[PDB]
């Protein structure tokens, strides 16, 4: 199945979807009539092939001269998030689901673009320094201007946790120069190991009913959860608890036996981790209605994640903020103020109980589940929409 969760990052109206299309052919759709013209809310999904010519996009070597057929390397799946500074929660969720990143910078649009920088920062925070950098709108720029842009980018990427991350000049519309990108996908991104015995944990980003308009109820379908595994091969025929729960104010975890564990385009026996998977469960498709299973944790039955509202956070912050042009000073965190705490996939609205030296105690208005220590990206409301302040770990 899908071997490595590779994410796509860039500015809004630059062409992440376009890039995906160029790579795979699989469309992110762009939907709900708002997003048909403009920008997606959900993650965009695509399945790209790597079968190398060693003597590729398709498993045949008729194209690159030598008739010695395309030698199977990998199959990779995309994690394409919204690159808008309003919808950052989704991006954050994607980030602690990904194994590696793909940057997208346009030629004619500037080098210190705010959103892109923010994305980069997020990636750095959430252990995602494996970034393949792509020059995108180069089918517009001069023989000198492009070079200048590249130089500027290089200059920028000197103090960042990205040091010598590779840059490729592609056209997402004209279909050129993606060979290099493909090569890098095997070269610069090795897949981090993901075993059998590391306790099975599924991180849900999407809720899906496949209940088509027109059918009869004597021919029914269950609930499908679109979520990623980063530990534990889920096999067909297992019982599950989804632990952030269902709301009564108290919450109670949801129990579902596996109908299917579906990856690629064809349903499989297994779901080997480091991939984003559509899990058919006996759970109602009415709870998989639109975007209900977003930021929920799934464990195999006989397991104890903990649903915390009162949290011990170890926090770290910036000197100067991101999301804006206008990079504003980080004023100190203020008590009993609504922050957004992004933990793996959750985007919970939290109130500050205490501020110490490097630790903070937080109240959650919506309960999140901590199994391990859990990776956090933090966010705040200063300029209406949510800006990225810093990062944390749950000290548990």
């Amino acid at each position: 199945q899908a071997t490595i969760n590779i994410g796509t990052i860039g500015h809004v109206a630059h062409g992440k979807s376009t890039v995906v299309r160029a790579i795979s052919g699989v469309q992110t759709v762009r939907f709900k009539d708002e997003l048909e013209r403009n920008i997606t809310i959900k993650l965009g999904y695509a399945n790209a092939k790597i079968y190398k010519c060693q003597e590729e996009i398709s498993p045949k070597c008729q194209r690159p001269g030598c008739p010695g057929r395309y030698k199977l390397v990998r199959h990779v799946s995309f994690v394409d998030c919204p690159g808008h500074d309003i919808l950052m929660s989704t991006m954050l969720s994607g980030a602690a689901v990904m194994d590696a990143a793909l940057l997208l910078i346009a030629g004619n649009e500037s080098c210190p673009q705010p959103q892109t920088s923010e994305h980069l920062a997020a990636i750095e925070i959430m252990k995602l320094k494996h970034v393949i950098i792509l020059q995108n709108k180069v089918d517009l720029m001069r023989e000198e201007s492009a070079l200048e842009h590249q130089k500027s980018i290089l200059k920028f990427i000197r103090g960042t946790i990205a040091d010598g991350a590779p840059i490729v000049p592609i056209s997402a519309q004209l279909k050129y120069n993606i060979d290099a990108v493909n090569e890098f996908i095997v070269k610069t991104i090795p897949v981090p190991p993901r075993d059998f015995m590391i306790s099975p944990r599924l991180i849900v980003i999407r809720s899906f009913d496949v209940n088509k308009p027109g059918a009869e109820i004597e021919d029914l379908k269950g609930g499908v959860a679109g979520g990623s595994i980063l530990n534990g091969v889920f096999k067909l025929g297992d019982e599950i608890e989804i632990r952030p729960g269902i709301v009564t104010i108290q919450c109670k975890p949801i129990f579902s036996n596996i109908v299917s564990l579906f990856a690629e385009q064809n349903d499989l026996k297994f779901a080997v981790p480091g991939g984003l998977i559509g899990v058919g469960t006996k759970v109602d498709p009415t709870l998989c209605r639109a975007d209900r299973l977003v930021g929920q944790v799934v464990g195999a039955k006989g397991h104890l994640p903990n649903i915390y509202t009162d949290i011990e956070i170890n926090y770290f912050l910036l000197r100067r903020l991101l999301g804006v042009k206008k990079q504003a000073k980080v004023r100190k965190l203020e008590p009993n103020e609504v922050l957004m705490v992004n933990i793996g996939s959750t985007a919970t609205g939290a109130r500050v109980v205490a501020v110490k030296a490097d630790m903070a105690r937080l109240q959650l208005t919506s309960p999140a589940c901590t199994e391990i220590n859990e990776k956090i990206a933090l966010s705040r409301r200063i300029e209406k929409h949510w800006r990225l302040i810093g990062w944390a770990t749950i000290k548990k």
Partner: peptide, 17 residues
């Protein structure tokens, strides 16, 4: 490195419509 990139860029420039 931005010089195994330079070659790529050159190639791209060569094969534009």
């Amino acid at each position: 490195v931005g010089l195994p990139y330079s070659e790529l860029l050159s190639r791209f420039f060569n094969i534009l419509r």
